[PDB]
Amino acid sequence: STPITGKVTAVIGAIVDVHFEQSELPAILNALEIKTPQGKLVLEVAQHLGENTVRTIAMDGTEGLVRGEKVLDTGGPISVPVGRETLGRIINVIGEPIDERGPIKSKLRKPIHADPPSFAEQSTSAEILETGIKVVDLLAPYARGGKIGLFGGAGVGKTVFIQELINNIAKAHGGFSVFTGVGERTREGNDLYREMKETGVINLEGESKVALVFGQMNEPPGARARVALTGLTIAEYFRDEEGQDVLLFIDNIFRFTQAGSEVSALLGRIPSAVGYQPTLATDMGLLQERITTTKKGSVTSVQAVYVPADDLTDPAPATTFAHLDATTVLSRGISELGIYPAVDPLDSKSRLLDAAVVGQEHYDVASKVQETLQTYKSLQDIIAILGMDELSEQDKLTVERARKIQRFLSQPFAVAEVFTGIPGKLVRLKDTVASFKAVLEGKYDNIPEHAFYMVGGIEDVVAKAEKLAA
Amino acid sequence: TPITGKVTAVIGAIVDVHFEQSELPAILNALEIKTPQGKLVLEVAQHLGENTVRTIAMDGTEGLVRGEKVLDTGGPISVPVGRETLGRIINVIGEPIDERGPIKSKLRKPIHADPPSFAEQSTSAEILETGIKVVDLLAPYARGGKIGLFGGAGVGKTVFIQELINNIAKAHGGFSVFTGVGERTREGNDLYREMKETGVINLEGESKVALVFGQMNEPPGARARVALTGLTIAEYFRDEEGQDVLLFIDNIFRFTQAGSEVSALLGRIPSAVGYQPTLATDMGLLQERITTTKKGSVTSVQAVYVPADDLTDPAPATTFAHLDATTVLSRGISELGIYPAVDPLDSKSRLLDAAVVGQEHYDVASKVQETLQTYKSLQDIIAILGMDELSEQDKLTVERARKIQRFLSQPFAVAEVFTGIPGKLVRLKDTVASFKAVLEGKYDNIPEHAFYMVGGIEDVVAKAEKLAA
Amino acid sequence: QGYAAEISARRNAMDNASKNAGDMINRYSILYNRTRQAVITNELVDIITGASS
Amino acid sequence: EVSSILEERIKGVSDEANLNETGRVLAVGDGIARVFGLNNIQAEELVEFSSGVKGMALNLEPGQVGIVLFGSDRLVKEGELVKRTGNIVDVPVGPGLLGRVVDALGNPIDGKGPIDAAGRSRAQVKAPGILPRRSVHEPVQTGLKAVDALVPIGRGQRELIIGDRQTGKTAVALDTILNQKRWNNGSDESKKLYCVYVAVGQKRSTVAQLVQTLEQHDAMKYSIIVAATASEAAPLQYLAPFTAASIGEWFRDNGKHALIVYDDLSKQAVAYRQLSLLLRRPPGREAYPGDVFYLHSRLLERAAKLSEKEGSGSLTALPVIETQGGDVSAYIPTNVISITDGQIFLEAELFYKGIRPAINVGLSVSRVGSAAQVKALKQVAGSLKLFLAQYREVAAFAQFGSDLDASTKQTLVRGERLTQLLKQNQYSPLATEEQVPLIYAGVNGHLDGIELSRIGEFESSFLSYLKSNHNELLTEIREKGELSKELLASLKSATESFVAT
Incomplete structure (x- = not known):
């Protein structure tokens, strides 16, 4: 109103407490700006502690601050800019373009915090997204407007997997996309910037069918926390106001959990189990609940998750595990087998995988795959000690098919025409169902195992067999 | 300085004094409360303001009456050093507890002394051979070094040190310091008697050894500064006398442990496992006050009581960092009956190198390590299925390794009572030869029992004949 | 004669294997139980330390 | 001598301070001082305690600004004044x-x-x-x-x-x-x-x-x-x-x-x-x-x-x-x-x-x-990753010691030699130009044949041999940094020639 002047009282960490002027109250989740020699430090009001002394969390570095110094109040949550002008620039957490494409020409601004749509608003249709990645398509098809979840290890081509998805699905998609990176390396960032300029999804002079919000780990933990909220609000504008479909991407959401855990500690809350914030459930919930397919629009989130030390029993992945619609696990073992995608075939479950939804044929084919692979794994121990010679004749044929199927999963990625230099492949959904059917029927039991490795469709399995035969 | 005070608190052995005058002693000054128990020596550790210091009490605090008069001795406690120390057992205060009356003092020096500088450092390269086969083979010691032992204390740990004293310190001669932090009083008495018997202490004559002893009955706080006191005695030799010394510390776990006890009372937020937050600094300072400067070279032997024998415990872990060589001795290897019980895959020295002890030694050691590691690798398979179900090639390795394991036991003369076997010291040159032969399977044709509890290769050959009869 | 000796030996041997494996089950069971308790204690201590502050 | 010039410099430090911020030490202990005052105080500032101890300041509290000493507190004492460096x-x-x-x-x-x-x-x-x-x-x-x-x-x-x-x-x-x-x-x-x-x-x-x-x-x-x-x-x-x-x-x-x-x-x-x-x-x-x-x-x-x-x-x-x-x-x-x-x-x-x-x-x-x-090194070590990965899998099976098939033992034999190839002497790194040949030999399976014991000998000798004859070749590996067809052929021939030593 009349800028509430505050004097810092304590610079502790990210927590900086301000002592706003008496008889003029600030409010929960407000935004304070402190004029600083470098920009405006933004402090988000996070508690009131009385005597008009608030305890606020920093969103920018707190070095050099002098205890006491005027703090203006800009009020309400940090308000980012939203628009169709936001497409085509990298925008940091405090809503400033960090790619220096000049100040975004704001139409509207919106607060970082927003309320999840009501039960009445939320109505979600089951539609089937096509990934093109064979393993994904057959064994856990993705669903339009879904909440796809890339549970996996640390950067185990985690970035790469997302990159393949952007390369295929995003370019294909008519909707906008928002690439939001929470606490990720600037090497990865610079590569993404360059690559998405290269793939032309960003055309600097041209149009950009994507916006970027790059939040990097070289930002205070507090700032790291509200990267997610910022990106989401851009998506809300797309979903609602622009009324278009979207295809949200957030990376890596363990960084979102981790960030919140840290500032929880700073907020003085007694640490919860395995040091996670005691508000973890509701905070995760606010993020996930905000993302939904309303009547207004549809947003297809793909959220990366890093499973610390590949223990999904760890509370942070486990809490996320419920909240995401179409789980996919990328496992160390499969990566190590040299199978890239690293997707764990018997540990991939999707909401839409129901027989009616994906069609009876798709279901039946995939059911046969699941049994075959699970059999192969159960028999693997037996092969290990006893050998393969002590197994049933039927079992021996099943093992042979399973090894073939195991490397039939392999597909070279379009974005690994750098990593492996092998031309990528997009295999039609129907074609994959057909091709897997043939294998299961054993109409390619005259094909050697390596002629299934990094192939595409049925045509490719045959072609690579002929090539190898020579 | 005569600064009266009253005792505001007596929270454990961490008395707090409140000076009434505005002259306030600094941190690490020392105070004497005079009582019918004589002086009690306390050391300022915090200033808590309002003319109220909080002091660690290095003597027992039972019977104190609050408000009791204090007087400030001023500055760090000054022990008395010289060569006159040699032939004394001294208490933490510096009292002559071997009751040879007042120690003829030359220079009395503050317990706290800053560690010598980076410039002052002088790096060792000496070979110090102990004639202990396992030591010689696996991880040779060096003069000036920091030697390290880990495992259960005085469960054989004390004996190991005693063997080292028996071997190294007569050959070394010159000044030597034994400092025993929180040791069993009876064991200390045994050491005192033994030392006098072996003439290292000759009380009629002169003693080329000095002793500092801190009993485990001594209050935790007292035990904390036993170590610092001993280091001062060592420094006088290292610096002022400038003659090479020796130093024994047993256990330096007691140093850490003592700190953890006082830490809680002092008012520190407990760090992991419960250890003091100043664990890293205190250990660091202590271990850099033990070093080989250009002024002098002090061979130190440090004994770590690993609690529950978990090396992952933060206090043993941070000890492992400051040692120059370690020879971790494992309870498992003790169960195997091998005395010395040094784990052979958990020993290291920066002195084991193919330059330092030459390629031939290094090659011999390499093969031992490989053989034993294989044997460790096949332990699972051995248990689940018989050794006959291992590969024939592997069975040779297993048989060799079983022999190596048995071979590694070397009877110790200090443990002569316990073993009942007369000890034997085997030359470094001899050790390399003995293992070389065994590795080439030259003498592999005679029972494992032949290799069991006996010395050098020649002794094994003879012991085969003994068994053969 | 040989084939019978082979299969007979295999039976005897695998039986002795089962015994050896059982002992190992018990040994690792004790380790498991100790380890489980220790985890509870170590986690609890962290919680206490936080609460104490 | 040197002393006279040092004393001159010391005399040459004078000039009063205006000490625009002061504060009195009070709670000090554990090497972590806390001073009362310092109304002006930048965060992360360096503050010179009057005792010649300097300590950075990491906590600013509306009571007592917590200045972490960089020295020992045995030179600090209660109620000292501290003067903010201002940097x-x-x-x-x-x-x-x-x-x-x-x-x-x-x-x-x-x-x-x-x-x-x-x-x-x-x-x-x-x-x-x-x-x-x-x-x-x-x-x-x-x-x-x-x-x-x-x-x-x-x-x-x-x-x-x-x-x-x-x-x-x-x-x-x-x-x-x-x-x-x-x-x-x-x-x-x-x-x-x-x-x-x-x-x-x-x-x-x-x-x-x-x-x-x-x-x-x-x-x-x-x-x-x-x-x-x-x-x-x-x-x-x-x-x-x-x-x-x-x-x-x-x-x-x-x-x-x-x-x-x-x-x-x-x-x-x-x-x-x-x-x-x-x-x-x-x-x-x-x-x-x-x-x-x-x-x-x-x-x-x-x-x-x-x-x-x-x-x-x-x-x-x-x-x-x-x-x-x-x-x-x-x-x-x-x-x-x-x-x-x-x-x-x-x-x-x-x-x-x-x-x-x-x-x-x-x-x-x-x-x-x-x-x-290195582009050359990428070409040579192309299937080194695959071989090693196969070796790992094979090695696991091999523990059970079941009668391994020849395909498994091709891997096993190759793998064992590769492991020995990797080993290197501590404090003695090797030139990359002369690491490219060693990997070529291994990957092109010439060493797979060569007996495990004498792999170490072979490695030493191979380098000597390449130094003797194919030192033109070595120069090229350094110079062109990508193995061309000619280099690949030269290298292939050299390795083949050295198979029997």
Whole structure:
């Protein structure tokens, strides 16, 4: 109103407490700006502690601050800019373009915090997204407007997997996309910037069918926390106001959990189990609940998750595990087998995988795959000690098919025409169902195992067999 | 300085004094409360303001009456050093507890002394051979070094040190310091008697050894500064006398442990496992006050009581960092009956190198390590299925390794009572030869029992004949 | 004669294997139980330390 | 003499202070002072306590500003006045740091006279942005063939050396520094990496041996040694990586390429723990304060391959984390693993097995991949990854000792020889130009035949043979750095010729 002047009282960490002027109250989740020699430090009001002394969390570095110094109040949550002008620039957490494409020409601004749509608003249709990645398509098809979840290890081509998805699905998609990176390396960032300029999804002079919000780990933990909220609000504008479909991407959401855990500690809350914030459930919930397919629009989130030390029993992945619609696990073992995608075939479950939804044929084919692979794994121990010679004749044929199927999963990625230099492949959904059917029927039991490795469709399995035969 | 005070608190052995005058002693000054128990020596550790210091009490605090008069001795406690120390057992205060009356003092020096500088450092390269086969083979010691032992204390740990004293310190001669932090009083008495018997202490004559002893009955706080006191005695030799010394510390776990006890009372937020937050600094300072400067070279032997024998415990872990060589001795290897019980895959020295002890030694050691590691690798398979179900090639390795394991036991003369076997010291040159032969399977044709509890290769050959009869 | 000796030996041997494996089950069971308790204690201590502050 | 000039300088420091901020020490103890006053006080400021103790200030409280001493409190005493320096912590940065051991405050502790400093800089400096960064494209060769082949090092990359305590832990890193002698001695400034070895938490004797080793290999003529020995204050230890980083940035800023080894960050965490818990900050997860991730991340993100508009600058980082009991789920190891772009897991069992350098190839990754691997070396080591992976699988089956089929034993035989090929003598890196042949031989299966025992002999001899005959070929491998058809044929012939020796 009349800028509430505050004097810092304590610079502790990210927590900086301000002592706003008496008889003029600030409010929960407000935004304070402190004029600083470098920009405006933004402090988000996070508690009131009385005597008009608030305890606020920093969103920018707190070095050099002098205890006491005027703090203006800009009020309400940090308000980012939203628009169709936001497409085509990298925008940091405090809503400033960090790619220096000049100040975004704001139409509207919106607060970082927003309320999840009501039960009445939320109505979600089951539609089937096509990934093109064979393993994904057959064994856990993705669903339009879904909440796809890339549970996996640390950067185990985690970035790469997302990159393949952007390369295929995003370019294909008519909707906008928002690439939001929470606490990720600037090497990865610079590569993404360059690559998405290269793939032309960003055309600097041209149009950009994507916006970027790059939040990097070289930002205070507090700032790291509200990267997610910022990106989401851009998506809300797309979903609602622009009324278009979207295809949200957030990376890596363990960084979102981790960030919140840290500032929880700073907020003085007694640490919860395995040091996670005691508000973890509701905070995760606010993020996930905000993302939904309303009547207004549809947003297809793909959220990366890093499973610390590949223990999904760890509370942070486990809490996320419920909240995401179409789980996919990328496992160390499969990566190590040299199978890239690293997707764990018997540990991939999707909401839409129901027989009616994906069609009876798709279901039946995939059911046969699941049994075959699970059999192969159960028999693997037996092969290990006893050998393969002590197994049933039927079992021996099943093992042979399973090894073939195991490397039939392999597909070279379009974005690994750098990593492996092998031309990528997009295999039609129907074609994959057909091709897997043939294998299961054993109409390619005259094909050697390596002629299934990094192939595409049925045509490719045959072609690579002929090539190898020579 | 005569600064009266009253005792505001007596929270454990961490008395707090409140000076009434505005002259306030600094941190690490020392105070004497005079009582019918004589002086009690306390050391300022915090200033808590309002003319109220909080002091660690290095003597027992039972019977104190609050408000009791204090007087400030001023500055760090000054022990008395010289060569006159040699032939004394001294208490933490510096009292002559071997009751040879007042120690003829030359220079009395503050317990706290800053560690010598980076410039002052002088790096060792000496070979110090102990004639202990396992030591010689696996991880040779060096003069000036920091030697390290880990495992259960005085469960054989004390004996190991005693063997080292028996071997190294007569050959070394010159000044030597034994400092025993929180040791069993009876064991200390045994050491005192033994030392006098072996003439290292000759009380009629002169003693080329000095002793500092801190009993485990001594209050935790007292035990904390036993170590610092001993280091001062060592420094006088290292610096002022400038003659090479020796130093024994047993256990330096007691140093850490003592700190953890006082830490809680002092008012520190407990760090992991419960250890003091100043664990890293205190250990660091202590271990850099033990070093080989250009002024002098002090061979130190440090004994770590690993609690529950978990090396992952933060206090043993941070000890492992400051040692120059370690020879971790494992309870498992003790169960195997091998005395010395040094784990052979958990020993290291920066002195084991193919330059330092030459390629031939290094090659011999390499093969031992490989053989034993294989044997460790096949332990699972051995248990689940018989050794006959291992590969024939592997069975040779297993048989060799079983022999190596048995071979590694070397009877110790200090443990002569316990073993009942007369000890034997085997030359470094001899050790390399003995293992070389065994590795080439030259003498592999005679029972494992032949290799069991006996010395050098020649002794094994003879012991085969003994068994053969 | 040989084939019978082979299969007979295999039976005897695998039986002795089962015994050896059982002992190992018990040994690792004790380790498991100790380890489980220790985890509870170590986690609890962290919680206490936080609460104490 | 020298004394008269020193006394003249001392006389030459006079002139009253106006002490615009004062405050009185009150609660002081544990080396962590807290002073009442200092109404003006920048955060992270350096404050000179009146006793010749300087302490940075990390907590500003509306009562008592908590100034962490850089000295011992045995020189501090209650009610002292403190005068704010008025400068946030800063270090001299310059070319003169080359060939100098320096402590945290930039005093030469090797006392090779005052540092020739071209500037001063500040401890915290924000990391290179997305915009001023260009993609890595410049190899860095460690001269450890296994490292180069499996986890190639580039410039601006962060790769974490992780593994069990002091398993020559320092030595693994030291080898990299030593191989940089080949380019460094060379006058190619576009291949000059000035090397900064940062030693935190190590005793003076350890450091002294290391600097001596560096002098022995006469590599100290390009090394900067930043040290913070274990005696030195926990605040100084905490500040020590960040002031090393700035020293690196002067090179980086000049566009000159450099590499900073941060050995060991694990002791930084202990230091920050001590510091935080005696700043009374709420205890973090696993007692390490919960903002350690932020601390480590900001430090690590300052090594980067700056854009070509930023003159292709590149500070390269190699963090080193000791895993206590090999616990990879511990909070501090977990945090670092995420931050970094590689893992270079060292395994103790394989060390004991005699695979030195010891690398568990499954737990070792380079997420920045072979974009920084030498083009020639990429061609030769193409299926080396596959072979090793097959070897691992095969080895597991082999433990059960079931009668292995010939296909499994082809792998087994090949694999065994490869493992022996990888091994290298500590403190003796090998030239990459002469590592490319060895890998060619192995990958083209010539060594698969050769008996395991005499692989080591063969390796030595092969190099001698190539030095004798195919030294024209070796020159070409260096010069053209990609094996052309002609080179591949020449090399193939050479190897074939040397099969029977």
